Amino acid sequence: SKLEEIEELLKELSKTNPLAKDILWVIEVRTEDGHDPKSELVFIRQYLKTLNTPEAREILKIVAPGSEVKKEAFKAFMDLMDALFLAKDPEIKKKAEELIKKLEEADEKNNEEELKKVVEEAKKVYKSVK
Amino acid sequence: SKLEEIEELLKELSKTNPLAKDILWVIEVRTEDGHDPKSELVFIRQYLKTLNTPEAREILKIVAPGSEVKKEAFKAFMDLMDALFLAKDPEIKKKAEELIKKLEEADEKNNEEELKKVVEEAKKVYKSVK
Amino acid sequence: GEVCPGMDIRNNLTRLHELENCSVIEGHLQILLMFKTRPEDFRDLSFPKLIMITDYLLLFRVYGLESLKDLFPNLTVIRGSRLFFNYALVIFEMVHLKELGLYNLMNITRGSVRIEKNNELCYLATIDWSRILDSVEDNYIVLNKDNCPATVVERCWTHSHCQKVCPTICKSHGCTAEGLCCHSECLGNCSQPDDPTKCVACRNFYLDGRCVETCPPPYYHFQDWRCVNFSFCQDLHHKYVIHNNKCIPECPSGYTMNSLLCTPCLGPCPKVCHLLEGEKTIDSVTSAQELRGCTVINGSLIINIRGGNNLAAELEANLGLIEEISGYLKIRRSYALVSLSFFRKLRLIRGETLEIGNYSFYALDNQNLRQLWDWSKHNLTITQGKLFFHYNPKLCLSEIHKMEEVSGTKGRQERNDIAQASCENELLKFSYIRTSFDKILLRWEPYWPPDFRDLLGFMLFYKEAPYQNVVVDIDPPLRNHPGWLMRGLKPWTQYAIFVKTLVTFSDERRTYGAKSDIIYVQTDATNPSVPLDPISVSNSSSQIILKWKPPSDPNGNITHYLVFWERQAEDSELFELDYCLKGLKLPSREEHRPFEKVVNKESLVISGLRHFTGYRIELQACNQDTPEERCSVAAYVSARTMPEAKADDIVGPVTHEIFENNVVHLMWQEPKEPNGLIVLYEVSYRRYGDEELHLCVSRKHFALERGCRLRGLSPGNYSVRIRATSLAGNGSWTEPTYFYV
Amino acid sequence: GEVCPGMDIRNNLTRLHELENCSVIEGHLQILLMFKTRPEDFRDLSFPKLIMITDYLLLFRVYGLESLKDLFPNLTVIRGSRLFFNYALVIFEMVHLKELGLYNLMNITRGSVRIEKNNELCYLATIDWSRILDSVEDNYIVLNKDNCPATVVERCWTHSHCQKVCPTICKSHGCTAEGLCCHSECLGNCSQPDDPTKCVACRNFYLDGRCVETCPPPYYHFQDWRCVNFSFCQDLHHKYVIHNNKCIPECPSGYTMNSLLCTPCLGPCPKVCHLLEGEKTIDSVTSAQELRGCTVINGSLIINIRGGNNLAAELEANLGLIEEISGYLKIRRSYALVSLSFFRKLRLIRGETLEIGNYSFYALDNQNLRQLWDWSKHNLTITQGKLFFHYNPKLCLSEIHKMEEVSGTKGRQERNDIAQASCENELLKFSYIRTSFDKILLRWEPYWPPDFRDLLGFMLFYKEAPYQNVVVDIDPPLRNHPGWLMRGLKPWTQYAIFVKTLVTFSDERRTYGAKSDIIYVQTDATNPSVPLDPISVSNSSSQIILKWKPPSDPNGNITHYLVFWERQAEDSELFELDYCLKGLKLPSREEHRPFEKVVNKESLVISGLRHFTGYRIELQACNQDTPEERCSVAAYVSARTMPEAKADDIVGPVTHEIFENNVVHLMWQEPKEPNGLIVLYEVSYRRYGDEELHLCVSRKHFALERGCRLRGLSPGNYSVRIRATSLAGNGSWTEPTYFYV
């Protein structure tokens, strides 16, 4: 799958990077585990947040398109686009009204961190809607 | 004088020790100063006590016979044995009675620090008598 | 082609009618939640003037739209200056859309396509986005219903609205509605071909109905899009600043206003950080790092630092950003910190934000500090509010005094605010010092506390002090004047030195303290180290561009390069050896040395020398230039100059004499300034009709045979040539000699 | 020769007459301090038996003595075991002595002379002190009044009491009263010459009227001067111990009693320190350094020390001497102290000395504990008294309970004995781990505090853990199991790993956190580094005592030395080119390589080889053998065996054939196991009357000419011999060959 493609291009990168090689080690040990690939993936992404060297950040972005976060934020925006008028409570609609403005802002300012916080909050609110 | 010969043989010692050469500089410095030779002498002796490396101690002993202290020790003996029977106050005589035992025990112990303290006491007692 | 700003429209389409006077939307168009609208609203409601949207489009629950061409059939470009999720258009969840059919779209300068859930909406896969959008990573198109140029199938928005594929030669600049390219400054379309004034969108800038490469002020550059007069720049500014002749919304980093010119600032910018809640508590480095650069502020601050050793370097880089604090600042329970000074600019707590109790500063449980500020050369002041210091008696009122005095806060506190007691009641004084280059005397006197017993000696701390950016103990004297010497120092090295007493801790009457003085002190200079990189490079036969580099140990203010050289008497082995074997065996290698105090030059062009001659070099490094000097042991090299192709030659032809028995005797002369030294002479000779033969003559052979001698020669006219060989190599041959044998 | 203990005559002359029973004074004699004495008390008193005083003499303020000879005419020796300020005596201000006149004084084993201000005392400078005192340069003879042999003045104590002359051959051992030397074991004098039983004093040991170099038990060695039975040794012991068969007052360091034998102890000795008032307080290392060695104690002590980082190594080196404390130990204002475990041996506070209120311990202001005691095994009990632990809530009651139980103070304490707190109130656990040689995985759970918000992540601290004689943070997880991996550990290296949670401090009852667990984990072994010191030493022509040394990186429990070698075929050039230019040009220098897993042997003997033959060596050093093996890239060397100067011979005589034109061909053969290889041959030939001459035949000359072909041989009987030259050298010549030409 495209995750296997990620792994193979990571073979490529590790051939151009030691850290990618360590990630491949992580990958094979996880294969030994064979548990939820996405869970281990997200953990490793957070591990990149941890090590967070410039090279680590680059590798993360490569495996973590970041614009990945952009698409996910777009989906959350569709969620809120439903919620702000079709939510089950006026309070939810008002919070979504705040949040659409907040998202327009974040989009202009286009900060990965601001957008992460916004989307997490959007999920929190959409809990009430769904 | 024994001071001058001390310097002259310290020439040899410094030729056998950098720190003795340092002391020779110090001697030059004092020469410029031209003040009480014994003053700077005893100061530098205490300076040896300060640096007090094994080599520093050896050098100090060489320039400071230490057994010197034993010479003032028998002098302080004369002082104490004079005071014990001729001291102006019975308290001074009893202090000398303590200090003779202290002398004998320090002789056995033959430590020069115990003896330094003892001779300080003897000086105080002798000053009280005279 | 007019221009108007782009806004959003929620459930009220009435504002769409305002687009009739617009050809460009300086922004986007966002239409959302139209439960009010119907097909009658949008089936042919059209604004053909509109030809481009800078940012993007949006269309959600837009009940009634039939074809996207209807509203803006002429719409051609989307600059995508800002793009919602990097997208250009939202078409989601409208069943009325039968098609898009926009028969004028040419290019999307930035972004991809989104369409979804729009029932009845056909002709989506038929679009060849490869030529339209600069970004086609994911033209999101799902859950919808879906003659003309074909690419791999016909490409078209509708079977009639054929895709407006311009000829490839038109580039992104676009083509007219008939398919004829536009000018390079144009983008997308133009009313007439190849005319910068007839464009619809500009590659560089739209200026007064015409595209221009650059914007002429007061019509400065506008966001790489158009030109706006300086008055409108100010209008945007006030409700935007000139940079690179561009009225950008704000100046770049390191810039400052010049009334609306973006003149560079001092680099750092006085950013007015209106603090979150006007506040931020500080205990750990991460907090400050987060807020680095708040050169200006609005708020107070709270401090609970966790410092306990020599590690403050991590900290002030974030600190000191301002000379004042409008509100208060609070600190409590801070760790074993010693210095309360490392805050660069700070000078005045305006205290406008009052700490509880109408305070404007607080300090308690900070029973740690022993350094606060250099008010001696630093200015303090405080505006208003009570200030709290109590329960921090590590440093007692001694310097507090100074603090409230310089703050001018005498009337703003009481002793209630203030209270291990490292508060030196005395400051000892140095008496005498004497200096070597590495070992320096000190002297002082039999100082004693009134209970002289309390004294336990003296604790020194020092350090090398090359610059003024900002370690042993002693025992008591006797009743007498002490001193000190060290060695660890180095020549001409400044050091800061300072002592405080080693004293008894008299508990209840714990002696409050006997400090000492401070001194920046530099040792004596001395003879430096050898100067390195000695390379005697030759620029010319008799010229040597010598070069060195400073020593490892300047050991004083450097004064001169005491250079020294001398010509070398060439080796006697060359005068003793003989090398005349075919396949030449040529060898290979008082006195006041002439000198100079070469100063500021790490090199020298030495003249008067001899090409390829042995020379011994010498250079003492000297940070002194008097007759007596701190001069290092010299650097040296046995330099040899560069040769000449004249000094290994032989002048004139070979002198010769002959005998009746076919014996030839030869003689010649050599230059007296050879390439170092001539050691042998190559010899060649020939008779007419025969062939030339080679021979060697060494200096010993030269002496024994007055040069060269030949025997058993064939009769007839004869010739001889000889070439002198020096240690630099062979020179020039002799002039062809001739004689009869 | 009687003997008496050293005794004092001070303030009273009544004890003088007991000296009559004495010949040896085991100690000193002290006469002083009674002004009442007059000449009538001493002018005629005599103790002739007196011979020797071990330590010294004295006379001042006991006025009256007229001559030392009368009192002790036979006084001869002074061992000077201990000396009067290194003087054997002092006579001062004695206006009564006319002379010492001691005509038997011969030796003073130690010390110098001091006699000052003694009026009427003559014949002091006349004394031949050089042969008497072992130290005369320290003599102090000033301000006194001052027929016999003269040495440079007449040497004598009086004009009649002449120097007791002992020939130089007598040494310090002494001579009889007549001047005849004594036995080597004697000292000073002897009743008869050359008899150890007639000595007056003994060099080594007095033994029952005789002198012996050694003391036979039970009459052990006594203070290097006599012998005493074990009975008297015990008598001295009970108001003394046998060491090296010597009854010394006490054994030297590292010794213990064995009832009176000086049995060695564990080195440290149980010294019972009755401290100053049985007390001490501690704030600086100097105190403990002073108080080193108190493996036993009598007193109590106090503690107050600083601290700023992991810097306590300086401390316990002086600490933990006893297993208990008779009284109390006190700690106050040691803010930074990390533990109370710094005392090795201590096991119980006897608390016999009680703090006020019958207390036995106190604790205050030490809010810096990471550890306290190895309670796991530290059975640190407490005997009696109450205790105090306030202002130390940094560590909480949860372990104060533990201290109480192990102290057994459950019935001796109250909450009044006890007081930022960092007492992690939960336990963190590890879910999974994986190990490489350098990179090691970790896992654990998505833990949350009940106020899950409070979590801020996790602070790991590890170290390498080869022995247990005694570092990064994380953020919170979420909904699951976190983990960790590092990069650069070393193979097969154990590490101690443990974590504490990063959490927000809540100033109410704080979320103290879930303390993690400690793990000592070793990384994977890996391929080691190359084994070094590869030396292929040749024990014989075909034998090589190879030797290496371990690699730089074992990278695991080493397993074997997989050696690999081969016999290298000699270079082709040596097999091709001719080397018979006079002034010899002799040169100089599947695939199963034979192998072996040499184990535990850093060296090897290799057989089946060839002298001076080339061999390419190899060794894949391995810490794994049976499966695929973790082995370094092998070490290597192109070893060459030691040569044999026999495998360069030419077997048999010189095969030859003759021609009529004085030309003779030569053929021969070479050994088939040469020194690497044979490149050329040396040919020697002679004729009668002539002399032998040499020629060379290369391999190519050998092949073309089938060896050698001598030409122009002198007519007559002719002989030839040949010797082959190998790269190692030359061997045996051919057997003589003869022929006629």
Chains contacting C (3 or more CB pairs within 8 Å): A, B, D
* Chain center to CA of A104: 19
Write down which residue in B43, B63, B83 finishes a domain. Answer: B63
Token pair 């002194």 is at which residue?
C624
Q: Is C274 strand, coil or helix?
A: strand
Q: Which residues, listed in sequence order, are joined to residue D604 by a DSSP beta bridge?
A: D546
Method: cryo-EM
> How close B119 comes to chain D (CA, Å)?
13
- Whether residues B46 and B75 share a domain: the answer is no
Q: Is C740 strand, coil or helix?
A: strand
Of D35, D87, D92, the CB nearest to B85: D35
- Whether residues B47 and B85 share a domain: the answer is no
Of D475, D482, D485, the CB nearest to A26: D485
What's the topology of domain D531-637?
Immunoglobulin-like (2.60.40)
Q: Do B108 and D33 touch (CB under 8 A)?
A: no
Q: Is C682 strand, coil or helix?
A: strand
Cβ neighbours, 10 Å, residue B106: 20
D214-264: CATH architecture: Ribbon (2.10)
CA distances from D386 to D309, D361, D381, D407, D408 (A): 32, 7, 13, 11, 12
Which residues of B are less than 8 Å from D142 in CB distance? none
Size of interface A-D (CB pairs under 8 A): 19
Comparing C-alpha atoms, which of D383, D322, D381 is closest to residue D351? D383
Every domain of chain D and the residues it spans: 1-164, 166-213, 214-264, 279-417, 426-522, 531-637, 655-740
Three-state DSSP string of D425-444: CEECCCCEEEECCCCEEEEC
C255-258 and C261-264 strand pairing: antiparallel
* Cα Rg, chain D, nearest whole Å: 47
Long-range CB contact pairs, B65-68, < 8 A, 24+: B66/B112, B67/D86
Mutate to test the interface with A, among C9, C86, C112, C142 (most CBs of A within 10 A): C86
For the four alpha carbons of C375, C378, C379 and C385, in that order, the dihedral sign comes to negative
Q: Which domain does A71 fall in, by range?
A: 67-129
Q: Chain B: which residues have CB within 8 Å of chain D?
A: 67, 70-71, 73-74, 77-78, 81, 84-85, 107-108
> How close C584 comes to chain B (CA, Å)?
57
CB-based contact C361:C351 (threshold 8 Å):
yes
Instruction: Say what angle helices A90-109 and A112-129 make with each other, to 10 degrees.
Output: 160
- Whether residues A115 and A83 share a domain: the answer is yes
CA distances from C410 to C361, C378, C432, C608, D204 (A): 14, 19, 41, 81, 88
Mutate to test the interface with C, among B42, B43, B53 (most CBs of C within 10 A): B43
> How close C35 comes to chain A (CA, Å)?
11
Peptide-bond breaks in chain C following residues (C–N over 2.5 A) = 146, 152, 239, 259, 419, 470, 479, 589
C77-78 and C107-108 strand pairing: parallel
Q: Chain A: which residues have CB within 8 Å of chain C?
A: 67, 70-71, 73-74, 77-78, 81, 85, 107-108
User: What's this structure's resolution in Å?
Assistant: 8.2
- Whether residues A81 and A56 share a domain: the answer is no
Alpha helices in C536-626 (DSSP H): 573-576
Comparing C-alpha atoms, which of B58, A32, B128, C144 is closest to residue D433? A32
As for how many domains chain A has, the answer is 2
Residues in chain C: 741
- Whether residues B35 and B71 share a domain: the answer is no
Task: State which amino acid sits at residue C259.
Answer: S
Q: Do B85 and D33 touch (CB under 8 A)?
A: yes
For C24, phi then psi, to 5°, come to: -130, 135
Q: Do D480 and A25 touch (CB under 8 A)?
A: no
CATH number given to D1-164: 3.80.20.20
Nearest-angstrom CA–CA distance, D670 and B55: 72
Retrieve residue C184's tokens.
């390079």
Q: Do C483 and B43 touch (CB under 8 A)?
A: yes
Which residues of C are less than 8 Å from D308 in CB distance? 308-309, 336
Q: What are the E-state strand segments in C465-540?
A: 472-473, 483-485, 494-503, 514-522, 531-540
Peptide-bond breaks in chain D following residues (C–N over 2.5 A) = 146, 152, 239, 259, 419, 470, 479, 589
Which residues of D are less than 8 Å from B67 in CB distance? 86
- Whether residues B77 and B113 share a domain: the answer is yes
CB-based contact C715:C741 (threshold 8 Å):
yes
Q: Please enumerate in sequence order all residues whose Cβ is within 8 A of that of D589, keeping only pairs 6 or more positions apart, or say none.
A: D570, D571, D574, D614, D676, D727
CB-based contact C717:C687 (threshold 8 Å):
yes
Same fold, D166-213 and D214-264: yes
Mutate to test the interface with C, among A52, A74, A101 (most CBs of C within 10 A): A74
Nearest-angstrom CA–CA distance, D372 and D734: 90
Nearest-angstrom CA–CA distance, D566 and D641: 12
Question: Which CATH entry fits the domain spanning D426-522: 3.40.50.1820, 3.40.640.10, 3.40.47.10, 2.60.40.10?
Answer: 2.60.40.10
Size of interface B-C (CB pairs under 8 A): 17
- Whether residues A81 and A46 share a domain: the answer is no
Q: Is C491 strand, coil or helix?
A: coil
Angle ∠(A14,A16,A17) on CA atoms, nearest 5: 55
Mutate to test the interface with D, among B80, B85, B101, B103 (most CBs of D within 10 A): B85
Categorise residue D110: left if φ over 0, alpha if ψ from -120 to 50, beta otherwise: beta
Three-state DSSP string of D624-684: CCCCCCCECCCEEECCECCCCCCCCCCCCECEEEEECCCEEEEECCCCCCCCCCEEEEEEE
The DSSP call for residue B119 is H
Question: Which CATH entry fits the domain spanning D279-417: 3.40.50.2000, 1.10.3720.10, 3.30.930.10, 3.80.20.20?
Answer: 3.80.20.20
Q: Do D485 and A47 touch (CB under 8 A)?
A: yes
CA distances from D139 to D85, D132, D174 (A): 12, 12, 21
Q: Please enumerate in sequence order all residues whose Cβ is within 8 A of that of D684, keeping only pairs 6 or more positions apart, or say none.
A: D692, D693, D694, D695, D720, D721, D722, D723, D733
Retrieve residue D30's tokens.
């002290």
- Whether residues A119 and A76 share a domain: the answer is yes
Which residues of C are less than 8 Å from A85 in CB distance? 33
- Whether residues B55 and B76 share a domain: the answer is no
- Whether residues A9 and A57 share a domain: the answer is yes
Consecutive H or E run containing D315? helix D313-316
Q: Which residues, listed in sequence order, are joined to residue D270 by a DSSP beta bridge?
A: D294
Q: What's the maximum distance between 2 C-alpha atoms anywhere in chain C?
A: 138
Cβ neighbours, 10 Å, residue B32: 9
Q: Do chains B and A touch (3 or more CB pairs under 8 A)?
A: no
Of C32, C85, C92, the CB nearest to A70: C85
List the helix and strand counts (H, then E) for chain B. 7, 0
Three-state DSSP string of C258-269: ECCEEEECCCCC
Report whether CATH 2.60.40.10 matches the domain C531-640.
Answer: yes
> How close B28 comes to chain C (CA, Å)?
12
Nearest-angstrom CA–CA distance, C337 and C365: 12
* Cα Rg, chain B, nearest whole Å: 18
Retrieve residue D140's tokens.
């102090």
Nearest-angstrom CA–CA distance, A87 and C90: 21
List the helix and strand counts (H, then E) for chain D. 7, 50
Report whether CATH 2.10.220.10 matches the domain D166-213.
Answer: yes
Size of interface B-D (CB pairs under 8 A): 23
- Whether residues A94 and A110 share a domain: the answer is yes
* Chain center to CA of D48: 54
Angle ∠(C510,C516,C520) on CA atoms, nearest 5: 150
Q: What are the E-state strand segments in C293-364?
A: 296-298, 302-303, 324-325, 329-332, 348-349, 359-364
Q: Do D485 and A46 touch (CB under 8 A)?
A: no
Nearest-angstrom CA–CA distance, C451 and C449: 5
C655-740: CATH architecture: Sandwich (2.60)
For D248, phi then psi, to 5°, come to: -100, 155
CB-based contact C63:C31 (threshold 8 Å):
no
* Cα Rg, chain A, nearest whole Å: 18
